[PDB]
Amino acid sequence: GELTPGISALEYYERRIRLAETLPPKSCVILAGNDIQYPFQQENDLFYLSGWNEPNSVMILEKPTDSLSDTIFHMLVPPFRSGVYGVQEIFNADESASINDLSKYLPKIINRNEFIYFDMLSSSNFKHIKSLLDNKTIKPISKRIAEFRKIKSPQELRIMRRAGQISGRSFNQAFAKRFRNERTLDSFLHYKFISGGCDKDAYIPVVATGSNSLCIHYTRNDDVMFDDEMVLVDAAGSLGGYCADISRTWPNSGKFTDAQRDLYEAVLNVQRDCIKLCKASNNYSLHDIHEKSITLMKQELKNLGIDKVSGWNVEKLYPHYIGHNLGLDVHDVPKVSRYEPLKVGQVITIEPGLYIPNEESFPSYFRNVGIRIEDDIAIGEDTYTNLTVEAVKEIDDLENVMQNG
């Protein structure tokens, strides 16, 4: 009885009611979808409110009076296709018509309203509607929708957990094998995601062995893997539209050396401490957490005795942010404030790292090594929930799977 994987048709209806509760009388909202360029990717604001996944379409939501029972939901679609009778019987549209009638259907709606919500600042239907609007007021709408998307419902949390569980078990199966080229490890993880139950990849992945791990945007993934190096991998799957995101690092030989042990433990110490902070009663913000992660890393660098190198402060050995919001997009809702306290229902990542250069000022057993560890965390009232907990990361658990399986 679901409409899309994990979401029922009743929740989609309740999302439209909540937005209408913030609009004045005589308003209409207009949203245009994407076109085929390639596997299709819908415009995510229109998908959040309807679940429709066909190209060349327009959605309109209208509020005639001050009562919530007079709302009207329109859809214009191409004539496998669902059709005019299917978009009402399955997707629950109040009115519908063919997309070829846009030049006569839309003007009748605009003329009888006072407020028009449209993002004036590329789809084919978008360029058409914008050309029409260049005693009424035009207003933006995209930022206002993002304040709803950042708080996940109990059903939304359950489908994100299933995608994180499938990706995490695939990592465990790769730990117990040996690979000699970056391309073989790449094609293995992709097949396990799909046969496990996911739809597709969530993003373009990283498979970087040896010195390749110093490039944050390395993507070629076609090099030979030596017996003396470690490898850094960043990849995950997606299901029903919702994304996951994971990072792990482990040695190619199957046993940690002494120098490899000391660097890995410094990164894992910071991550564990920051995850414990993710409680809504503490009143922390996302930027507060980033500031505390810088203070914790420089104490770890002092214990290693590598904190007084001329020209290499902490911002150059750890040169990126601590995390981001996660949802229908990988970098979800980037226009909300980083400086307000975190609320019950958000999902954020935690991913610190370290990267040592090839300079004589450092010990020879530390040059050209990079490490990163990342998980997905949901915020609760007086606790939290780790959505990717199946994938092991402790040193004793890692060596046990690599040697015994």
Binding site: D234, S247, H320, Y321, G323, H324, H331, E351, R372, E374
Partner: peptide
């Protein structure tokens, strides 16, 4: 991964 990382935003900035």
């Amino acid at each position: 991964x990382p935003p900035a």
